[PDB]
Amino acid sequence: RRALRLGVNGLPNSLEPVNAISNVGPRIVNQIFDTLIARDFFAKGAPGNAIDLVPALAESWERIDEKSVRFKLRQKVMFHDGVELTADDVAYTFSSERLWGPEAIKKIPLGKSYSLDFDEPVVEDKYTVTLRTKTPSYLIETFVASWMSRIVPKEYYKKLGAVDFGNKPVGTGPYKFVEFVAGDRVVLEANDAYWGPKPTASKITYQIVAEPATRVAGLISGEYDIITTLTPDDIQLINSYPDLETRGTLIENFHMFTFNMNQEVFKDKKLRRALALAVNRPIMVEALWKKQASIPAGFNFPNYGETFDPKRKAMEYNVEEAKRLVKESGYDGTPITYHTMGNYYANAMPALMMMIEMWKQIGVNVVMKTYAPGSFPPDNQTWMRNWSNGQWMTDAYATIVPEFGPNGQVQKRWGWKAPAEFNELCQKVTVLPNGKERFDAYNRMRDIFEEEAPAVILYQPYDVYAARKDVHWKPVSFEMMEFRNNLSFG
Ligand SMILES: CC(C)[C@H](O)[C@@H](O)C(=O)NP(=O)(O)O[C@@H]1C[C@H](O)[C@H](n2cnc3c(NP(=O)(O)O[C@@H]4[C@@H](O)[C@H](O)[C@@H](CO)O[C@H]4O)ncnc32)O1
């Protein structure tokens, strides 16, 4: 076969599937690992956005009650080291020890905050395991199809520890691990024992090319087969080449900017709300995205299904109100830093430049502070910063509760003093079934989020890739790359 060469925007700090949840991690861990349930993005001729759930490591599954789903596992599946996958590896994957228990915080910092209210799994036999929650939860199924639920080998994982495992991953996926050089590359090779639609590449290299211009020059050279994290501003040049083309889709993710609310200037919602009210998203969508970005009506997305509100109003744009709020705040005109890891997010630096001018017009002075990967300063040294959230469930629970809820990093690490009402509705939605009460609680949470402005939603980016026309691969509507039945050459 042919070795696949990818020019990427970045690499994760770990290949441990939960510690790799990011914009740059899933495109690699999707190859090394498998989930029990998988999403079939290409079902019924869909352009990589189908929401269909198909069996993967679990040949079948059945909800027993409001707290548990029994999985019947595929037999003779092998981990990359020849160890057979059993219900024991599945129990360990979702165990208190490895993922949601108090001890797990040390190994997987965000594991507990991103997990459901789990109870210990029950192994029925070598190929049957029941995944359980201590309280009623109809979210088990979407969680098991997610980036939180890639299956790890119990013995090898325990032998190495979560940290050492992140540097030498072992999974059941189509590509086995070969090498990980931090700040340089990840090399994978075909797992010809995949259970499993056969890998079509002999090797895959994820090479960091932090500058998008060097990434485009690389594809034209051509040092790469496919490049990631481009901007619609690159579309005309790449598409003029006869052997090159762009492939892009709107993904189930939103770009945003957030604050360190532990800082004096961001303790009260007034200056956060003023900055949010001056963000002119429609011009940013023209200037930078060429109409290829979607401004959502709040923390509300179609993939939420029954908890998506299609009648919700757009987020407010009000420069006069923003001006008044800056005057009403204790802000004195002192510069505020906004940290960004270059263009890790597409259009991050041109978006900040545009917003800096919008903010200067309402009386706020924002300065760009750029930083290299691995050099993010202590929390204490940061004020504003960009971020993104992948909506990883077919429900509104993610990501408002895992990220912005009472037990999340935005309140616990970044200092958001959320109102009591916001945290009460977070608990209610987690345990209430779908209905009038749960739909309304999410809307009231969305209304609270906009007034509080702990983060400011910008848009759903159109994820732009560029590839050699002789590399047949289609983007999916998520921050990952899929090669199963979606990769061929010539
Ligand atoms: C281990 C330490 C001892 C060590 O020194 C070092 O590793 C360190 O500094 N660690 P620290 O904790 O300070 O991590 C730093 C702190 C800072 O906030 C930054 N950051 C966090 N999420 C990031 C991200 N998310 P993303 O947008 O690509 O991916 C998101 C993901 O964050 C999110 O959880 C998920 C679901 O909403 O959506 C993805 O889209 N993209 C780029 N930067 C990110 O990394």
Author numbering: 32 to 521
Kindly provide excerpts from the paper associated with this entry.
To our knowledge, the best known system that exemplifies this paradigm is the antibiotic agrocin 84, which penetrates into the cytoplasm of the bacterial pathogen Agrobacterium tumefaciens strain C58 by hijacking the PBP called AccA and its cognate transporter. AccA also plays a key-role in the importation of the characteristic plant tumour-derived compounds such as the opines agrocinopines A and B discovered in 1981 in crown gall tumour tissue. The mature AccA structure is a monomer of 493 residues composed of two lobes, each formed by a central β-sheet flanked by α-helices. We identified the pyranose-2-phosphate-like moiety shared by these two ligands as the key recognition template for AccA.
By the molecular replacement method, we then solved the structure of AccA in complex with agrocin 84 at 2.15 Å resolution. Overall, the ligand bound structures are very similar (average rmsd value of 0.33 Å over 490 Cα atoms) adopting a closed conformation. While Agrocinopine A is fully defined in the electron density maps, the leucine-like moiety of agrocin 84 is mobile. Notably, the electron density maps of agrocin 84 show a D-glucopyranose connected via its C2 carbon to the N6-phosphoramidated TM84 moiety and not a D-glucofuranose connected via a C1-linkage as previously suggested using analytical chemistry approaches that were available at the end of the 1970’s. Our structural work showed that the toxin agrocin 84, composed of a glucose moiety linked at its position 2 to TM84, is recognized through a D-glucopyranose-moiety, whereas only a furanose linked at position 1 form had been previously suggested for the structure of agrocin 84. Moreover, in addition to their pyranose interactions, two of these major residues Asn54 and Ser419 also tightly interact with the phosphate/phosphoramidate groups. In contrast, the sucrose moiety of agrocinopine A and the TM84 part of agrocin 84 make only 3 and 2 polar interactions with AccA, respectively. The sucrose moiety and TM84 occupy a different position in the binding site.
